Write a protein that binds this ligand. Structure first.
Ligand SMILES: C[C@@H]1CC[C@@]2(OC1)O[C@H]1[C@@H](O)[C@H]3[C@@H]4CC[C@H]5C[C@@H](O[C@@H]6O[C@H](CO)[C@H](O[C@@H]7O[C@H](CO)[C@@H](O)[C@H](O[C@@H]8OC[C@@H](O)[C@H](O)[C@H]8O)[C@H]7O[C@@H]7O[C@H](CO)[C@H](O)[C@H](O[C@@H]8O[C@H](CO)[C@@H](O)[C@H](O)[C@H]8O)[C@H]7O)[C@H](O)[C@H]6O)[C@H](O)C[C@]5(C)[C@H]4CC[C@]3(C)[C@H]1[C@@H]2C
Ligand SMILES: C[C@@H]1CC[C@@]2(OC1)O[C@H]1[C@@H](O)[C@H]3[C@@H]4CC[C@H]5C[C@@H](O[C@@H]6O[C@H](CO)[C@H](O[C@@H]7O[C@H](CO)[C@@H](O)[C@H](O[C@@H]8OC[C@@H](O)[C@H](O)[C@H]8O)[C@H]7O[C@@H]7O[C@H](CO)[C@H](O)[C@H](O[C@@H]8O[C@H](CO)[C@@H](O)[C@H](O)[C@H]8O)[C@H]7O)[C@H](O)[C@H]6O)[C@H](O)C[C@]5(C)[C@H]4CC[C@]3(C)[C@H]1[C@@H]2C
Ligand SMILES: Nc1ncnc2c1ncn2[C@@H]1O[C@@H]2COP(=O)(O)O[C@H]2[C@H]1O
Ligand SMILES: Nc1ncnc2c1ncn2[C@@H]1O[C@@H]2COP(=O)(O)O[C@H]2[C@H]1O
Lengths: 904, 904
């Protein structure tokens, strides 16, 4: 029976972990102490052994085959993959250097200390045991303190490589030692080394790729993805183990880091459930193994205790600390030379960053059980248990005190100021809500002292050199204002998460250096296509059965395209940022020279950044249109979600249907996320011109031979000025313009509109000024082209009637929104319901039209009319009231009357 | 080796669920078909048996000990406990009657059909097999259709009791049959029946209570509770099994229904993760066992196949359908008589609601494996496999077609109308957002036809008799009008989930009957304390070591209080509802007599509902104050969460601190759940008068003895009328009043204020009219008591200073909000910063006060003043400008001058 032992183990771990949270020490030593407690009954009363002897002696196979894979997999499952791959090369080379030197320096101290009959193999055993690492406690406490993000992820990163290489070296040397009958030739050894090296990782890569491709074909299902993920993970581990006894751990590590690298094709509930399940398994295993070593070491290491061994325990700690500090200090210059160097504070927290854990204890138990009836294994356990308990119990306190005195974990002034402002905002919000609650007529019998005292909220926190200090304060104000503007810019759905993280990383590293601002060379290389990728691009485009080659090449290009997309929008963000510079920095500033130099560097950055964006869009337009479409879809769907949540909160519908509406918009989200990243070609300009307006006339296709200029106007170029003679005409084909006219009005004209309408109709000069806020492509149309079009209309003036209706809309809408006869009319209503209309020719009516009940809206566009009863001479563009039912018009060649009629 | 079989089972189940989910048939038969597929290779190629013989013959013990508990537990875990206990007695007694009559009517058909050497024991075997039920597919399809919640939950309800009683009867009869050496005396049988009937569930009740009490002591820890809940469930099952081989299933059922009945003391992530985990385990077991039976039945039932057996499988289907329909039809009148009758549509869908599942197949395999080398077990398996495969596949189609033709699952007109209105609201919102986005100067190069084509959204759906029809339409308009008002009224956090569910159930059952409105007798018994509970309350009040008795009695009272709170709460909701009736029903109505009779019946309902609410307040006030405080806490917390979400959306802070803020509001929420349902005593108003206003002066203690009227004024009672002589004075002690005064103003006055100040100070008649909108308790203070107060003022008139400051604020605040010298001043600011003030006696200054820079605010409360330079005769209550620096006052006994001064 083993039920009582494991159940009590779970209960003891639960109570200890829950209780011992106030102190900064990890709870695990309590478990260890509990094991030592069992030691005393492990010497006295037989009832405990007969209930614990079966669990006291697991076969080593179950330990090395079950506990190691799950712990190593969990250590590799909670990673931030993007931050890890930001600096993967540096951390892996530093980790491999550290582990090889820590392994090789153990032999000299082993021979200088013990002077026993211990070969180099025993030294390798000891070095493999002592080099294990555990980052859980330190990363948990630094998240509790919130010092830095890249620090925590690299700290949790290198422990994976340390543990993997340690178990590899241990296991090969262990097969060398305890089974000497095996072949130990150099050729077989290098074959074993290379085999797994090149295979296990690629085997895991292949299985991860095929399982994520299979997972990509699942929509709105709940069970199959978890079932298939668990099955794939186990099958990968089993195949890896049956191939090589060692390679399974590396295979599951690579599988975990790949599957954690994908989040877009899997629903959020799936990975939060998977994270919870795996973390629970790891916690259970950790508690069990720590209590296990605690109970076994007391009964085992009772006879090998010695004072010289205690002195050895004292000196191995100083040895490991000094060698780790020395190696990180001497490879610090190499880290500085590569361009990813860290500060001396980062070095000194690297000095105390080491922490052993469960994996070293596991390897200790398994090497004991392979050792068998010998005092040497008990010696190993005594050393490793002593060193791990002392190193963690003093390491936690030392790092806590070190960050206390050095104070890199202290929060900054801007963030605590913002937190205090938020607290005060919440305070007066609840104050005014309470004041509203006072006036209610149904809650007057309730007291308020307990109500206020139970709902309080508080923050958890609680000379030229003068010119330099004040400009430093000013740059701090500028940087906090810009990053909060960046957050606001991204919260309306207008940016991407990766773009946000890269941009705030750039801002933070720019602000870290003294008197250093945001710079663009980092942005330049962020959008620049460097590395071996252009080399392989040139190779693939030069070399181009056969069917496998081209398809992959396509998505290969897409990868590069994806990169460029990110670059484009991050530059886009900076534009908005510098836009805020133009509208914020003029208020909190107090000095003139500092203000003007900050403005000056602002312009210089702006003019430096506009040009390369212009060239990248001028050579690669499909990327621009694709990311713009992604932008538009993201923002409109985000606002749709916000307004459906508002309508739910408005109480106009129950939440049961809202629970399906959110599913509908969620499947729309995940359809968007798997966007056609393959770049769609921009639509043809002539095709867009044909689509934009109902050009049913074939002479309009013949008008392409009369209207084909493709003229470009750059930023700020005024096209026409008011008062100029109406000679030309323009059709916009690329860009957006702003028109100012005369009260006064401002309009925005996009692609697909005609300009110069009144100058041809009324033969009047220019009256409104148009400006272009970007490079714009336009077609040039002459007055001779207008005459040719008028000839082409012949019996049926299609475009003439269409433009008459259009100009009627542009005249009517301001007076509709201004007059009291139309109040509450929206832009869409006046742009949609007014389209159903036509014109009446006055030649057939002898310039005498009778208004009846069928007519609903009559607007005089041009000409002068007279009332048939009061002889009221009215002129354009006054709106005609419904009182008049008959009008008289004079046939004037200089000003032909124009009227619009709307039927019922 | 068995890895390949189970892995292939997982893959085949996943691919079948992915590929067949479009059709309304369950995927399970597909699995069954795949089992038959294996059958053919199970005859020919030896490579499959050697890969499946180890899994072809599991020991029956592991099946009956593993697969049954997890399946029955999962059937008991996804339940809705409140609707389950709404009609527990009815559903359990009907389930018991149905299962016993299904059992006993199998022997007659067994003897009339087989005519074999089968004892009554074989008949009970068959009846235990065939009576199993499985509601998963039918509840899934009806929840896809969304016909009725109570129907689906009760149909999921009875299957648990059916399966539990079936496995109990099977197991006792199997122990009787295959092990005849056991004792079969009546005494031992009845002892076993008693120890499985009542001794079982109480053990699970005790373990659930102790584990939830243990769980209640942990706040903000997301790991320990999972690893303790799973251990508790496993130990419960193990102890239940070792105590008795049968009762373990009943114990785990009762544990599941208790733990699912608690949600408040456990974080939501815990139960969503636990539901996902357990449901995944049950799905995996179901798939495995169905593939198992599909493989085994082909090789086993190949030799016993016969056509007359096929006729038998035809006739058993008809037998079960006719007996089930007959028994439910003949116990329908008991349901009608008990007050929980169902419609004939409910009866006819109850006829076809039967559906077998995995449990019957499990019992079939285990009875075969106990049978061993015999043809009778293969006979059993052939019958049960054939009947389940025909019944489920044609039952799904028949119920689908039946709901298609009868149309109880057709959605109503109002809800689809509301869905269409919401769709048009979403459409106009996205239209205006698109119009706004068109004007941007950064997205001009983006097309819109794919953009519009990627954001479409649509609904998933697509004479006196005339007087009766139109009043039916009017009452439908009314009922939707109120229920949407009820949803809105809950949405601001002003209700409770249980009260909402009970109220909407009452509204739905009121709307179910034709021309029937909402009633109050149902509401009356909803808040009425009936049953055996008041009888045991009387017994416990009569009867009252010793220490165990009183404490439980206390929480016993608390349970009663809980019920009353809900009653009070639901009553409050109806008041809001009737308020909406006063402001809605007057606009869609078109007829006069229907409108006036609806108003009349509404008012009769109002006058009927106010009186019992008033009494339940008058004998039990502490419940009222407790629920009012709970309401206040709920609404302020909800609005604080909304405004912190808005401030996040305003782009003023990042989400990392928002995580801490939502953690803080969630711990405040669970502290609200920690608020004692035990009723706090109402505060003693005479004792609390010192808290309401400073009563440290002993003359105020004497004034407490001066006036102790405690008079009650009912609803709508005007206390004083304007123009009446100033004879008395009032201090409110319980209630809220509305004061209308003269521009004109409306004020709301609560407990803790003094009225009638101007009638004593200025000796003027009443100018404003006060009304009380409820029953109010007040103290009567005379003008002779005002002369006693004149004696009390003495040298230092502190109470006079306080009331002078109060009336100064009263005069100033509308003047502050109206004058242009104070723009943007809030009520809190003018009520807080103006408190730091005092008065200066003009007698010591000879009625000549000099204004300096120290003074900041000067307001003339009363009297007439004159300027020292311009001789400007100014009078109260005009605000004094800062231009005047000296004033003269005339000593007049009729109107003594009074001014308020504020120091800097
Ligand atoms: C994933 C996470 C991590 C943690 C965890 O999951 C979650 O991991 C899981 C996994 O990792 C599990 C382990 C996997 C490996 C398992 C190996 C298993 O060994 C085998 O277990 C068999 C079970 O039927 C037999 O052994 C019996 O085991 C019972 C349980 O302890 C004893 O109860 C019984 O003995 C009886 O009671 C005790 C004594 O009175 C007598 O021995 C006898 O009356 C034994 O019976 C066996 O048969 C004979 C008697 O009937 C011999 O006595 C023999 O003993 C011999 O000598 C040794 C013992 O002295 C034994 O090792 C050897 O084989 C034998 O020849 C003995 O075993 C068998 O025989 C033995 O091999 C062991 O039981 C449990 C075991 C460790 C598991 C324990 C629980 C775990 C950790 C789980 C744990 C929760
Ligand atoms: C949910 C979280 C995760 C972790 C955890 O909970 C929290 O999970 C829990 C759960 O998963 C537990 C496991 C569940 C399964 C358990 C299996 C159990 O062994 C089995 O126990 C059965 C009990 O009915 C049978 O054993 C019988 O034991 C009898 C004792 O006298 C024998 O007489 C008889 O047969 C004999 O023994 C077996 C064969 O040799 C022969 O049939 C015969 O010689 C056996 O069968 C009846 C069976 O035969 C045997 O195998 C083992 O002893 C412990 C066990 C592994 C448990 C260990 C503790 C756990 C892991 C718990 C753990 C805390
Ligand atoms: N209200 C208006 N809205 C949009 N465009 C206008 C409006 N009024 C005038 N225009 C355009 O501005 C042009 C200015 O010169 P034209 O008169 O040649 O032709 C005019 C029209 O094309
Ligand atoms: N602006 C005000 N706000 C609140 N209460 C007032 C206001 N003006 C007058 N009152 C009260 O209304 C009472 C009406 O009669 P009295 O003049 O006796 O005393 C008066 C005050 O108590």
């Amino acid at each position: 029976k083993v039920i009582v032992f494991i159940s009590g183990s779970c209960l003891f771990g639960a109570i200890s972990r829950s209780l011992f949270k106030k102190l900064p020490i990890p709870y695990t030593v309590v478990l260890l102490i509990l094991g030592a407690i069992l030691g005393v009954v492990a010497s006295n009363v037989p009832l405990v052994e007969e209930h614990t002897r079966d669990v006291a002696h697991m076969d080593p196979h179950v330990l090395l085959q079950i506990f190691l894979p799950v712990l190593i997999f969990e250590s590799a499952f909670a990673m931030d993959v993007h931050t890890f791959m930001r600096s993967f090369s540096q951390v892996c080379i530093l980790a491999l250097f550290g582990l090889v030197v820590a392994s090789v320096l153990t032999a000299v101290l082993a021979m200088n200390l013990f002077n026993y009959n211990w070969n180099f193999s025993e030294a390798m055993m000891f070095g493999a045991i002592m080099s294990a690492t555990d980052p859980v406690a330190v990363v948990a406490l630094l998240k509790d303190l919130g010092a830095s993000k890249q620090l925590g992820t690299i700290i949790e990163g290198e422990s994976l490589l340390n543990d993997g290489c340690a178990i590899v070296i241990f296991n090969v040397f262990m097969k060398m030692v305890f089974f000497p009958q095996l072949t130990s030739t150099v050729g077989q050894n290098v074959l074993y080394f290379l085999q797994v090296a090149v295979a296990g990782p690629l085997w895991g890569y292949a299985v991860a790729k095929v399982t994520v491709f299979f997972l990509s074909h699942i929509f709105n299902d709940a069970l199959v993805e978890i079932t298939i993920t668990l099955a794939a993970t186990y099958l990968t581990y089993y195949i890896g183990d049956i191939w090589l006894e060692v390679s399974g751990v590396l295979a599951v590590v690579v599988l975990g880091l790949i599957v954690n690298a994908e989040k877009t094709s899997i629903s959020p509930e799936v990975e939060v459930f998977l994270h919870r399940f795996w973390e629970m398994l790891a916690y259970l295993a950790n508690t069990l193994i720590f209590m296990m070593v605690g109970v076994v070491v007391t009964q085992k290491a009772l006879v090998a205790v010695d004072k010289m061994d205690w002195f050895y325990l004292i000196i191995l700690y100083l040895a490991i600390t000094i060698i780790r500090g020395m190696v990180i200090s001497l490879f610090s210059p190499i880290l500085s030379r590569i361009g990813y160097g860290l500060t001396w504070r980062n070095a000194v927290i690297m000095t105390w960053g080491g922490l052993r854990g469960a994996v070293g204890l596991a390897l200790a138990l398994v090497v004991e059980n392979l050792a068998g009836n010998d005092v040497i294994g008990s010696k190993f356990l005594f050393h490793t248990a002593g060193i791990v308990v002392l190193t963690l119990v003093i390491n936690a306190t030392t790092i806590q005190t070190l960050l206390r005195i050095l104070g890199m974990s202290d929060i900054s002034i801007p963030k605590r100021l913002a937190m205090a402002g938020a607290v005060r905002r919440i305070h007066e919000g609840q104050n005014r809500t309470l004041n509203m609650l006072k006036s209610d007529r149904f809650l007057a019998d309730a007291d308020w002292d307990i109500a206020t005292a139970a709902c309080e909220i508080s923050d958890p926190y609680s000379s030229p050199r003068e010119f330099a200090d004040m400009m430093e304060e000013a740059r701090l104000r500028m940087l906090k204002a810009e990053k909060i503007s960046y957050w606001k810019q991204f919260e309306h759905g207008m940016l991407a998460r990766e773009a946000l993280r890269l941009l705030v990383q750039h801002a933070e590293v720019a602000a870290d250096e003294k008197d250093q601002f945001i710079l663009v060379d980092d942005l330049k290389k962020s959008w620049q296509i460097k590395g071996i990728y252009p080399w392989l691009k040139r190779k693939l485009e030069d070399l181009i059965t056969k069917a496998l080659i081209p398809k992959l090449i396509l998505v290969v290009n897409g990868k590069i395209n994806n990169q460029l997309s990110l670059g484009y929008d991050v530059g886009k963000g900076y534009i908005i940022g510098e836009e805020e510079v133009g509208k914020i920095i003029d208020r909190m500033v107090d000095n003139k020279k500092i203000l003007r130099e900050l403005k000056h560097i602002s312009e210089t950055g702006r003019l430096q950044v506009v040009k390369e964006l212009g060239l990248l869009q001028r050579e690669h337009p499909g990327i621009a249109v694709s990311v713009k479409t992604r932008q538009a879809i993201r923002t409109i769907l985000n606002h749709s979600r916000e307004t459906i949540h508002e309508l739910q909160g408005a109480g106009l519908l129950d939440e049961m249907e809202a629970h399906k509406l959110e599913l509908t918009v969620e499947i729309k989200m995940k359809r968007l996320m798997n966007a056609p990243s393959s770049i769609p070609p921009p639509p043809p300009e002539n095709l867009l011109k044909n689509v934009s307006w109902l050009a049913g006339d074939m002479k309009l296709i013949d008008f392409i031979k009369a209207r084909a200029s493709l003229l470009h106007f750059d930023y700020g170029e005024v096209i026409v000025r008011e008062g100029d003679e109406s000679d030309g005409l323009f059709l916009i084909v690329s860009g957006l313009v702003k028109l100012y006219g005369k009260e006064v009005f401002e309009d925005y004209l996009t692609v697909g509109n005609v300009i110069g309408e009144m100058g041809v109709l009324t033969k009047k000069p220019r009256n409104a000024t148009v400006t272009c806020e970007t490079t714009v492509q336009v077609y040039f149309i002459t007055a001779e082209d207008m005459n040719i079009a008028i000839d082409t209309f012949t019996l049926y003036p299609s475009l003439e009637y269409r433009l008459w209706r259009v100009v009627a809309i542009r005249i009517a809408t301001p007076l509709i929104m201004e007059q009291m006869a139309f109040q509450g009319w929206t832009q869409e209503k006046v742009k949609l319901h007014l389209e159903r209309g036509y014109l009446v020719d006055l030649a057939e009516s002898h310039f005498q039209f009778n208004i009846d009940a069928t007519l609903e809206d009559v607007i005089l566009i041009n000409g002068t009319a007279y009332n048939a009863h009061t002889r009221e001479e009215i002129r354009s563009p006054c709106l005609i009231s419904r009182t008049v039912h008959k009008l008289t018009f004079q046939y004037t060649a200089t000003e032909e009357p124009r009227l619009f009629v709307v039927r019922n």
